[PDB]
Amino acid sequence: QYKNICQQVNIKSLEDVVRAYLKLAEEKTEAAKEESQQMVLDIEDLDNIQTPESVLLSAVSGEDTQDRTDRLLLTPWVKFLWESYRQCLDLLRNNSRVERLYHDIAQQAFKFCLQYTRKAEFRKLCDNLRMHLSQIQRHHNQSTAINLNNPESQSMHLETRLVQLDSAISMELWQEAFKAVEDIHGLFSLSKKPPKPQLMANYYNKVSTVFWKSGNALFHASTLHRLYHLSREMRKNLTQDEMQRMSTRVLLATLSIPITPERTDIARLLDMDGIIVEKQRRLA
Amino acid sequence: VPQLQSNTILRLLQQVAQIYQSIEFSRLTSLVPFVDAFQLERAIVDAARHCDLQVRIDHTSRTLSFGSDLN
């Protein structure tokens, strides 16, 4: 109702209202955890810790008392917040015209996922992808007149990126990171009409790093050299008067390089056989 | 670095099959500064098992034979 009446009129109201809403809900969950995590958590393991009479029997398929009673007094807050974030900006602003705030919302969601449950990531990520698809493959409304408006574009881009990257490389997720990279690639494909602004180098380095281990230091070292080359362009444009930087760069390069001289394709040597090469080409 | 150290060892291990035709394991120990022999032999037998070199490092006398061709 509020967005409607406050439509092609005044948005300053919506910004103040919806920020104050999510801020009130965040404080209820802050209080709800502390409450359960200081008073009720100490009430739980309170006193001794030997013999539960019926605590040992369920020890064959149970957990700790803090999770067992934090579910009674914190899960509510978390759940509520999650639902709100999902239906809030999402089910009320999966697009529109201007008004960023979206970035802040995304950041909040990411933080929540990191802290509380992680499953939320799958839901949030899914919703985001769906929204990006509706627009990118939608185009049918007085929405954003895409063309040469790299502002909002670059913004959202970097946003999701950093959020996705760290997100996955935080809660030990990986499929999420993969999806994020795929999305970024798609954006670049449909967003290659512009020369190229900053952040590029940033993201590149970040990714190469996050990689390093998982994949072999081969592709990782390749991405490292890519970031090194980016430091050259950014240099001519970025201008970085520091020798230490160059040193570190060369070092990273070397390592990522000398590391593996051959791969042990056991799975392949077994089954025939991939279904395991074109994927490498895709990574390339 | 530790993988790249093993990669340098792996580089060394491939060469000496053309430099030598056999070598005693006691000589072979002194050729290569490393943490332990008991570790490194298994990492050679690993490389050998993954067909990167051919060696008869395991053998009754505890001596190694690279061999001119054999097969």
Added chain:
Amino acid sequence: IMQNTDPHSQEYVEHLKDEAQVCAIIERVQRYLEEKGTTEEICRVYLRRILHTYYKFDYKAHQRQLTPPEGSSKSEQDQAENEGEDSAVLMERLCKYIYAKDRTDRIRTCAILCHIYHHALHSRWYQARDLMLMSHLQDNIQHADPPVQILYNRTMVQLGICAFRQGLTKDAHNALLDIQSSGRAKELLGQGLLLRSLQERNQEQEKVERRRQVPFHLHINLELLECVYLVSAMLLEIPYMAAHESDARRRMISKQFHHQLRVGERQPLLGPPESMREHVVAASKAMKMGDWKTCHSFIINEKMNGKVWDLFPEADKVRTMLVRKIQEESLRTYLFTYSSVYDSISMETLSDMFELDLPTVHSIISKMIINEELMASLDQPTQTVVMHRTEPTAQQNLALQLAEKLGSLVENNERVFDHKQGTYGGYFRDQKDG
């Protein structure tokens, strides 16, 4: 009550305190009916007393085994309270009375299943096996009531877990195969409905299946069941996949392990493992490379301990047995994968590399040679294994696989020739053999 309280609320632990009062009332009623009751009332109370005891691990019997009585003197009064009749001897007495006095095949059938479950829970595999085989319930259980089928399915899982605790990985795999490969294990064990089947059932049937669910303190963790199944599959299928990598006739032992491995191999980004299934898939990749130390770190980490191994009444015995079984079968996958590179190997370096006793190493290698699994000879004075350089080249392996395929094409051409020569067989067989 214990079907309608939430399993994760503190209220479940509160209502479980009353279980001790229920057990005491049943004991008071048992003693009273042993003096005054009919044999058909006694056999029913004996079944109810069995029903609250068969799932409880006797920590008092185990504590009495962990302290041998070497030497401290206290009080004859502390002995009279220690004469608490073992849950095992009580179970054996009550079950033998039912077998000898019961006029109903139901109470007898529930008693034998609870008896087998209680032997299996206490690591007494031989007794549990011999009672299960003697019962012939495998053929007959299909016509028994669904709550007795749920008890049988829970007893079969407990037999598989008992075989696993005894290091009998093959018999553990066989007992768990049909239950886990069904994709319906949660329902077959009475532990709930699968949400994916909620769309296909009548609400009245669902309301009857909900009443047939066992209380949460009678559940066997499905993640423990699947971990024991996948680890039993891993220890059987990887030595087989290493030895037979060259063969055209790949006999998959576990279709479900082969599905899970193919799902993990289809992820373009494999992170550090978080799920119990990813840990066993990561360990399966390490075990094909013959590295037992990364296999051990993926199977025995803090996450898998608190999620699977600490759910056992004897966590450290199953840990030490599983470490030994990872060492014993990784020595075999290592020998199968790297035989082609080794001309001779000492048993001393295999003892040091795998942290295994020399008689065990010798017994494994001797058995691989006797099974024709390893093309090697054993030199008894030097304790060396000398390989026979008779291994087929990739071109010789393609020729062997082509010879097997040509033999199969001849066998099928002979079958087709017999079906052709059989004519057309309809007109020439009706005039010789009155």
